[PDB]
Design a binder for this molecule. Structure first.
Ligand SMILES: OC[C@H]1O[C@H](O)[C@H](O)[C@@H](O)[C@@H]1O
Ligand SMILES: OC[C@H]1O[C@H](O)[C@H](O)[C@@H](O)[C@@H]1O
Ligand SMILES: OC[C@H]1O[C@H](O)[C@H](O)[C@@H](O)[C@@H]1O
Ligand SMILES: OC[C@H]1O[C@](O)(CO)[C@@H](O)[C@@H]1O
Ligand SMILES: OC[C@H]1O[C@](O)(CO)[C@@H](O)[C@@H]1O
Ligand SMILES: OC[C@H]1O[C@](O)(CO)[C@@H](O)[C@@H]1O
Ligand SMILES: [Cu+2]
Ligand SMILES: [Cu+2]
Ligand SMILES: [Cu+2]
Ligand SMILES: [Cu+2]
Ligand SMILES: [Cu+2]
Ligand SMILES: [Cu+2]
Lengths: 333, 333, 333
């Protein structure tokens, strides 16, 4: 394979490495490195801990962006400081269990996989070492996404280009943290020590936490998502194990690929869309009003009580035609 | 804003206030009033009670119907006989958390919000006072829907009008009623007294009841939905917090907008469709056979055991070409 | 009704009785027989038993295949060796609760129902005897599917034929097996004896097992699904009671009707699709690589831990352009 090589410097979510939408480049070999990190992290404002397993140190793993017909060459590294075997399965890829059957590496090893990006869209990638380890590694955080853009950029299915001003990647994680007898969340010294209790809970299918970007409140405050009135924002949403129903409170999905695949035209003007577990989807919105927005899964129990709320802080001029407080709160006549 | 004003007299679900489909009217300011009522209600045939919180006294709140480009001016009233603050978030609206950030009212107050109906479809509206109160108020019953029709009425995406003879609004409600030690449903003296136990249950994500129109059996018997053979019926279905999968037993969805948005063409000939939690969808069916139909969510446990069954009673002539009992039950030869 | 009659010899899933895709036949009366069998079966590799109730002895019931405009004439037989009344509801059919209101038969009886196949797609059929028996009979295994093909075969919505080389039917079953105090699965002497404990569990909405073709591992080993590189395989997936999210690990859904209805164009290039509870869907894939594939629901806990994994074993030549192991596992430099 004698194509040009291009290195990408990955960046942590919710940001996305610089890329072109429409491009005049032809196919390349695009080189990525992912280094697995097992680590104990804090997942909520109460200080609950969690035995995480990650690509590149983050939940989700970083978004990889290429174009249709590129070859994606990933160096997967499992440092000796980890305890378990790991691999990678790309839903964008064809053959060998998405790459999983060619990438199983023990601590101290690395492997190099190349796959041709023949399918456009956003896709999950995740670890899948075999058997009961598959769900455990995924719900411990070992999942991310890849975006395979058409070379001509995105379109509306009616001949018109859809160009985003910025893209964010929201990875949603269902987490299963067991409780002790008195009802407090348990802490564990290693992923292996967490496994028995965590699997017992997993099989009951109810998460303790549902978070964006690895933690309750990760995408709020200093780390709120941002936009300006007039900006078209693409929001890629993934969930490797469990369904989600994204909703932008105060906005819409102007153009939505809920199954996440750009060979299909987007749907228009959605209130809430649906990310099937094991997939990524994408929604574009042009902001029309300034202020705070919440971006949630619209199981509101999950959103408000289990962790699944992000914010956008949007700058610009208020549009009284679109919405106005005609009369402020006042005593009932 | 110097447009004509038009008042609407809302009606309780499953009925829908009189409206035009295609219209020659231009944009108007359409005026609605919603008065919040907190009240203890009975939700099943066993006499289980429930601390409900409602718009206009009903679960769901009434369906509001306007056309694209209208301005919707809602007077939201929170009488002093209630105990909690409330607000309203319209998924149809743009800005200020759907209106929620402009409509928080204490008992004894009212507020007037106007929003421009720039997106067509059926949409959820719900209370969303902030934080953990958001899911609690929604699952206590504070949700309804609005329908924003194209000015030319509905179409099939192929150039042809789709005119309904009647429309019904089915609001589905997941309810979380705690049990005592011996396994009976608990009763509470106030919503505030119900909150701690109810939140603990909510976070476990399994409802005790799933009902249409506020109660097991609400849309059966005297209150069955009705039609005649030959009539095209539009069924709007909403679920503000949790997924549903509507199905008309003995029928189909001839034309279905499962994501609920009229900028998209309907799907045709469905058996079962999917309402993502936090959304409304709509399905049209032309009845071809008389008799009893059941309209359910097709988790049949929810439908038959947790409350989520409505009936249609349909008049007209049986069509033996479409279906016939060739041989009645008889002993096996 | 003076049309030609054609008998079909049904075959057990995942296989499908021989049929034409495009056909020059006109409408016929197509005759099927289903004989109900209640039986205790083993559902996992641990030897857990289950009080099953089945059409034709299998879970799922066999796939019935006809063409648009055919009349489907089913002899439903409830032998005296069974204990309960049963019936059949076809989601493909119009009127009388899908046929259920015309087919209730006691042990020792049979009935003959005819329905006209006016809607194309794949559809669920299931037992539905009334009230709380409806979910119980369905989750005990009394569900299958029917496929109603266009007379011109399948198409891509763009004018082009889609011809499958083979079709498989994957019926997914949520099962509710109670546990005793010490945590072992219970065994029962009859379906009636299992009912009280099984209903109590059903209402909590969490299955103990989620299986394909009636058992953990049913579609693995000797009984793996098969294909060759170059073959277009249609996979019909049904779930009569609960949502599923199919995914072919290492492949895609080239053409997918996730709502399962051929009046709608397929979506293209999916990673994971969604089968709403109470429906069947269908996905076509042309295999490009040899080796083992897993076909799962992509709640990976369900797939790996509760039973919901099938395999494909695919023969042919490996395509290094699509995927290659550039560097095998090696020590990190
Ligand atoms: O981007 C996928 C397809 O989108 C649309 C265009 O009509 C088509 O030319 C393009 O190939
Ligand atoms: O109703 C939304 C759209 O539906 C379709 C029509 O071709 C288009 O003219 C209309 O604007
Ligand atoms: O198969 C359903 C429809 O598919 C497409 C074709 O354009 C149309 O002629 C056909 O009737
Ligand atoms: O946006 C993707 C869609 O747009 C088109 O190219 C033009 O309508 C379709 O062929 C494709 O499905
Ligand atoms: O019914 C809505 C659909 O119908 C059309 O106007 C004509 O095909 C489309 O542009 C739109 O998506
Ligand atoms: O494949 C089914 C689809 O294909 C068409 O016949 C041609 O585009 C549509 O009318 C139909 O929805
Ligand atoms: Cu791993
Ligand atoms: Cu996967
Ligand atoms: Cu409220
Ligand atoms: Cu909302
Ligand atoms: Cu039965
Ligand atoms: Cu059914």
């Amino acid at each position: 394979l004698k194509l040009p090589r291009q290195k990408v410097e990955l960046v942590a979510p919710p940001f996305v490495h610089a890329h072109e939408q429409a491009t005049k480049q032809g196919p390349k070999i695009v080189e990525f490195k992912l280094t697995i990190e097992e680590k104990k992290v804090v997942i909520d404002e109460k200080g609950t801990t969690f035995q995480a397993m990650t690509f590149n140190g983050s939940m989700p793993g970083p978004l990889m962006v290429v174009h249709e017909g590129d070859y994606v060459e990933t160096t997967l590294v499992n440092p000796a400081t980890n305890t378990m075997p790991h691999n990678i399965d790309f839903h964008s890829a064809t053959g060998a269990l998405g790459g999983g059957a060619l990438t199983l590496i023990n601590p101290g090893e690395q492997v190099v996989l190349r796959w041709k990006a023949t399918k456009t869209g956003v896709f999950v990638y995740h670890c899948a070492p075999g058997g009961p380890m598959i769900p455990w590694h995924v719900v411990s955080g070992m999942n991310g996404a890849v975006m395979v853009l058409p070379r001509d950029g995105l379109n509306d299915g009616k001949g018109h280009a859809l160009k985003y001003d910025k893209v964010y990647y929201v990875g949603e994680q269902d987490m299963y943290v067991p409780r002790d007898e008195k009802g407090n969340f348990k802490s564990y010294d290693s992923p292996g020590e967490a496994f028995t209790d965590t699997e017992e809970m997993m099989k009951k299918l109810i998460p303790s936490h549902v978070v964006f970007n690895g933690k309750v409140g990760a995408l709020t405050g200093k780390n709120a998502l941002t936009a300006n009135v007039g900006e078209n924002v693409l929001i890629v949403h993934s969930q490797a194990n469990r369904d989600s129903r994204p909703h932008l409170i105060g906005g819409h999905g102007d153009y939505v690929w809920e199954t996440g695949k750009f060979g299909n035209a987007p749907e228009v003007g959605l209130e809430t869309w649906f990310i099937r577990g094991g997939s990524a989807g994408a929604a574009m919105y042009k902001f029309m009003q300034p202020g705070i927005y919440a971006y949630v899964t619209h199981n509101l129990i999950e959103a408000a009580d289990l962790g699944a709320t992000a914010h956008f802080k949007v700058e610009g001029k208020w549009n009284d035609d679109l919405m106005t407080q005609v009369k402020a709160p006042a005593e009932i006549p």
